[PDB]
Design a protein around this ligand. Structure first.
Ligand SMILES: O=C1CN(c2cn[nH]c(=O)c2Cl)CCN1Cc1ccccc1C(F)(F)F
Ligand SMILES: CCCCCC(=O)OC[C@H](COP(=O)(O)O)OC(=O)CCCCC
Ligand SMILES: CCCCCC(=O)OC[C@H](COP(=O)(O)O)OC(=O)CCCCC
Ligand SMILES: [Ca+2]
Lengths: 491, 238, 86
């Protein structure tokens, strides 16, 4: 009934429970409390939106406290008992699942993770080793395959080797796709049988889709689509299946031969080629996803990635302007659809004409004007109706001014200020992403490149309890007793 | 080839042409190396150094860009390679008066996609003799997407990065410029070359004493005036 | 065996030896100590990369101290004897 009092009371309660002192005193397990409280506050930040800043700051407070708690450890065994609590690193899995960015990127977690990554030298001491072990990968694959023995199968299980093998397989896939269009490998005819390399690339597409469905089994399109890098995988795989199906159905319908020129649109072979081309584009773009593993490109790639949701807003304001001017010009010019004696119409032939006749052609005309690829004579008619021609030219000029002078500088002027607040959290986010990548190459889940894809729980709480006692002691002594002295003086 | 014949009726890989090309490139490089002495001035020096250090920030982008270029080249070449007409056309490629066969092979595709950044590629290059309007439309759409990505997302994220990378450069301009100038100056002190290009055909046991005395005095002055009288202007706390 | 303790100990030692007071007290020649220490710290900044900010700041500290030491000269002959040494 009393909304104001009720909401303020809820805010007071949450502002209370997120206090490091109270958590240190009345809590069975501080880490779980920090995680749960951060999640709950973050979620309420979106529904109680009128009070939005307070919750978005309390979440930050909880995360910082969680990091500082683990800060004051002193021996690697203590850390390893903290992380291996409930397989290995279940605590780390939970932290990742709860988006504790400031917790994972902590200079002690990274040391342990790197040490368990490499398992064993400036610029060429590694650059030749990696490529060389990348070439002769299939021998290792088959050896682990048929004889998962101590000989060389134990030389795949090291994650830094599994990663190299997987990326070498990916590079091979890309090379095959690149040479798939060479002229060395035919007489174009109707519904041909699969070429010599289609049978070669089929295993890659099948293995990729197998891995995709396998991994999808868990998320089930929920809490699993949020990542943008995965939606591309979905669409590529669907497109590849579509290509397979179209090539099949074409092979058995038009089983003959005739010159390619005398075909018609919507012929199955052409649709089978187009989507294949698009899929090639998408795979070669998906290549970029592994730059997060480097160190000079990683941070930059993440920074560029986050400054994209800032752009879609402009590519949504721009569409309205485009529609307005398209409407206007099309309404003005649609009386002069000559198309008499001209073999090719539109804005694409050698001598552009009928630029604004219909509406689709108007959209194309106005989109291609951003790059200055539309000549200036397109705004004429056979008659000398100089008034209409002048008004058309004026609409065109106004559109050009608006776009290329007000909607392209207000984009840079926005990107700069939106980027200022991005370089203050670069290392944290990059390291979090790198860790997310690394952890995927630890379990014995796939362990295989694509082409070849055919007392204990009652007692151990004691040590962890002891460690929590010691850590809380250290923290409360050295963080809220000796940092409460260097504050300042007032009246 | 100690003879004489009209230049037109030669062939590529003739030694004289290769002897002229590299000479031209060397001329380019020397005239560029000219800039190296601007560090000796005072109005250009700092600016030149500042521009020089903000180059390793760019190579990262000229490495991200190559991946995009390869992706779209792959796509378009795969789509168009069925129409290598080259019948009745004297000059093929994107360089002749009437551009054609823009996407036939892969090298020509790389050239086509690189020359589109400056808007030097006309729009009719994406046609075929037949009216296969579906393929033509898809080709035009790939081309347009590539243009948008490059000239609107990979050219403004370059300025937006240069600005913030340059902010932390103007706070150490004089130091670096003076260091570079000194490095230049010291090279003209010893009697090493002393000649322009065309015409190119007690003592060590005792002196430690004074320097020891000077160190004693300097350390005295420093410890007195830097960690005794600067430890007083700090501030108050609880 | 204990990577954490070992690394933290090395950091503590280097953070100690780069102190202007200790250098002023226990050093035969302060300038050479500043130069060598700055070089060593800068080099370790690239191998012990997980602790990267601390070393990249200790190098700055050493360089600043080296400048301030030569700051407090008073006569050109003193400076010229400082620079012409070997
Ligand atoms: O997630 C994807 C997308 N991938 C698919 C999946 N289904 N259909 C496709 O077309 C593509 Cl390209 C393969 C690449 N990776 C992962 C990855 C990234 C970087 C290095 C190596 C790997 C790999 F070795 F683990 F594969
Ligand atoms: C700025 C002075 C321009 C004068 C040029 C001129 O007189 O030609 C009319 C121009 C268009 O040029 P024409 O149509 O070719 O005459 O109209 C505009 O672009 C207005 C800009 C709209 C601005 C919002
Ligand atoms: C912004 C609305 C543009 C509408 C213009 C249009 O309908 O023509 C299709 C355009 C290309 O133009 P045409 O191929 O000539 O039709 O496709 C794109 O450029 C998509 C941009 C890709 C963006 C990532
Ligand atoms: Ca995936």
């Amino acid at each position: 009934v009393d909304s104001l009092r009720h909401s303020r009371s809820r805010l007071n309660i949450y502002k209370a429970l997120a206090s490091p002192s109270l958590i240190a005193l009345s809590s069975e397990d501080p880490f779980l409390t920090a995680f749960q409280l951060s999640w709950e506050l973050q979620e309420l930040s979106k529904v109680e939106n009128e009070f939005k800043a307070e919750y978005e700051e309390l979440s930050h407070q909880c995360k910082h406290f969680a990091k500082d708690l683990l800060d004051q450890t002193r021996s690697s065994r203590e850390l390893e008992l903290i992380l291996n609590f409930r397989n290995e690193l279940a605590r780390l899995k939970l932290a990742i699942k709860y988006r504790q960015k400031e917790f994972v990127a902590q200079p002690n977690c990274q040391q342990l993770l790197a040490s368990r990554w490499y398992d064993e030298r400036h610029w060429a001491g590694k650059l030749i080793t990696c490529v060389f072990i990348g070439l002769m990968f299939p021998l290792l694959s088959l050896c682990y395959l048929v004889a998962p023995k101590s000989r060389y199968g134990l030389f795949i299980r090291k994650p830094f080797i599994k990663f190299i093998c997987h990326t070498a397989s990916y590079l091979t896939f890309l090379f095959l796709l690149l040479l798939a269009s060479q002229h060395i490998v035919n007489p174009d005819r109707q519904g041909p049988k699969p070429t010599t390399v289609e049978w070669m690339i089929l295993p890659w597409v099948l293995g990729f889709i197998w891995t995709e469905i396998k991994q999808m089994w868990d998320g089930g399109f929920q809490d699993y689509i949020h990542d943008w890098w995965n939606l591309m995988d979905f669409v590529m795989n669907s497109l590849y299946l579509a290509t397979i199906s179209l090539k099949i159905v074409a092979y058995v319908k038009y089983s003959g031969c005739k010159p390619r020129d005398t075909w018609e649109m919507w012929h199955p072979t052409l649709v089978a080629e187009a989507v294949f081309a698009i899929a090639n584009i998408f795979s070669s773009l998906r290549l970029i996803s592994l730059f997060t593993a480097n160190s000079h490109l990683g941070p930059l790639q993440i920074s560029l990635g986050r400054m994209l949701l800032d752009i879609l807003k402009f590519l949504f304001i721009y569409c309205l302007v485009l529609l307005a001017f398209a409407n206007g010009l099309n309404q003005l010019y649609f009386y002069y659809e000559n198309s008499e004696g001209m073999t090719c119409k539109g804005i694409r032939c050698e001598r552009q004409n009928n630029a604004f006749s219909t509406l689709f052609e108007t959209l194309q005309s106005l989109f291609w004007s951003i790059f200055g690829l539309i000549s200036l004579y397109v705004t004429n008619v056979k008659a000398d109706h100089k008034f209409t021609e002048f008004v058309g030219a004026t609409m065109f000029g106004t559109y050009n001014v608006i776009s290329l002078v007000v909607l392209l500088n207000m984009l840079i002027a926005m990107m700069n200020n939106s980027y200022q607040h991005i370089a203050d959290h670069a290392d944290i986010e990059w390291k979090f992403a790198r860790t997310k990548l690394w952890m995927s190459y630890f379990e014995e889940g796939g362990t295989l490149p694509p082409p070849f894809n055919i007392a204990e729980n009652v007692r151990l709480n004691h040590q962890y309890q002891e460690v929590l006692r010691n850590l809380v002691k250290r923290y409360v002594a050295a963080m809220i007793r000796d940092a409460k002295t260097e504050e300042g003086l007032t009246e």
